[model samples]
Target: KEKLVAIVGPTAVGKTKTSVMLAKRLNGEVISGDSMQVYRGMDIGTAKITAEEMDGVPHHLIDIKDPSESFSVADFQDLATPLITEIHERGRLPFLVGGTGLYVNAVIHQFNLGETPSPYNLVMIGLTMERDVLYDRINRRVDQMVEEGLIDEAKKLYDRGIRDCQSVQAIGYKEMYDYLDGNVTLEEAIDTLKRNSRRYAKRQLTWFRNKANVTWFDMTDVDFDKKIMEIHNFIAGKLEEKSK
Candidate 1:
C-alpha cells in the first residue's frame, strides 16, 4: 500500500513545523489542509509559511487562489485527491498538514468523494496541549500575528470589500475587519479574535476526537524535543509495518 501521514491538531500547536520535519524525515511533500491558507496575500492572518520557512520542502494547496475567489470542499477533494496519488506515484509520501480536520479526513475517510478506495495507507497523528496551555498559546499567537502585519492585510482586504469574498468566513480577517469598521475597538477586536480562535481550536479538537481515529500527542509538560522524536519514531514504526 502507498502511505500518507497527517499531522493534525488545533491552531498554534505547530502542525506546520512538525509536518516540515516529518516531510524531511520521510522525503515527503506537504499538502495543506487549512481552508484559509489557500488564499493568496493572506499570509499573516492565516499564519501561512513563507518559502524560506518551508525549508525547501515542497508544499501544496497554499496560495492557490486570490482571496476574492472561492474554494469549496468539493474543489479541495478534487484537487487534493489526485495530488496525493501523484505524490506516491512520484515516490514520495504525502504529509497532509493542518488543523482543518474535515479537509484532511476528506482524503482519508472518503467522505462525499467517489466510490474508489484510496490506494494509500493513511495514518493520522494529532497534536494538542492541555486546554489552559493551548489557550495561552492561542493568545500569544494572535498577538504575534498582529505584530506580523495582520492589521495591514486586514485593512487592505477590507478596502477591497473582503466581506464579499468567499474567505470572509475566516476568523482573523473578519475580526480585523470589525476593528477597521469601528464596529469594535481595536482591543475588543483583538479580544474577539482570540476568543474566536480559541473556540475554533476547541471545535477542532472536538471534531478530530469524534471524527478521526487519531493517535494523539500531548505537548503540555514533556520535553518538546523528546516528544517530537517519540512522535516521529511512532510514525516511522507504523510506516515500516505498513510497508511490510
Candidate 2:
C-alpha cells in the first residue's frame, strides 16, 4: 500500500506550518485538501499558503480554478487520487493538508462520491488547541488578514463582478462583500467574520471527532520543535506498524 499522511484541523490552528515541517522531515509532497483554496484570486480569504511558506516542499491543487467556476468534493477526489498515487510512485509521502472535513474524509475513506483496496496506508494527524486559545487565535488572524490586504483582495474580486458565487460565499470574502454592497460597515463585517470563524472551528472539531479515526494532538502552549517531534514519534511508530 502507498503511504499517505493527512494533517487536518480547524482554520488558524497552524495546519499549514505543521504540514510543511512534517513534509520536509518525512520526504513528502502536499496536496491542497481545502475546498475553497482551489480558486484563483481567493488567497487572503481562504488563507492559502504562500510560495515562500512552502519551504521548498511542492504543493498541489491550489489556484487551479477561477472564482467564477465551481468545484466539488468529487472533483477534488478525482484530482487528488491520481496525484497521491503519483507522489507515492515517486517515493515521497503524499500529504493531504486542510481543514475541510468532508473533502479530507472522502479522499481518505475512498467514499463512493461514487468509488481503492484503498491502496493507502493512511496516517491521519489532527491538531487541536484549547477552545479559548483557538478562538483568540482566530480573532487575531482575521485582524492580520485585514492588515495584509484582505480588503483590497476582496475588493478586486468585487471589481471583477464576482458576487453570489461559490467562491465569494467563503467567510472572509462574504463578509467583506457585505460591506462593499453597503449592507454593513467594515467594522461590523470584520466582527461578523471573526464570530463566524470561531463557530466554524467549533463545528470542525466536532466533525473530525465523530468521523475520522484520527490521532489527535493538542498544540496549545507547546514548544514548536518538541511538539513536532512528539507528533513525529507517533507517525513513525504508525508507519512501522503498518509496514510490518
The TM-score leader among the candidates is 2
Per-residue lDDT over 22-127 for candidate 2, one digit per residue giving the tens place of the 0 to 100 score: 9898899999988787887778888888999988999999899999988888999899999998998889989999847878877887888862344578888888
Q: Give the TM-score of candidate 1.
A: 0.91
TM-score (all chains, Cα) for each model: 0.91, 0.94
- Pairs of residues clashing in candidate 2: none
**Candidate 2 stretches greater than 4 Å from native:** 114-119
Worst 10 residues of 2 by lDDT: 111-120
Clashes of 1: 0
Instruction: State the RMSD for candidate 2.
Output: 1.9
The alpha-carbon lDDT assigned to residue 199 of candidate 2 equals 93
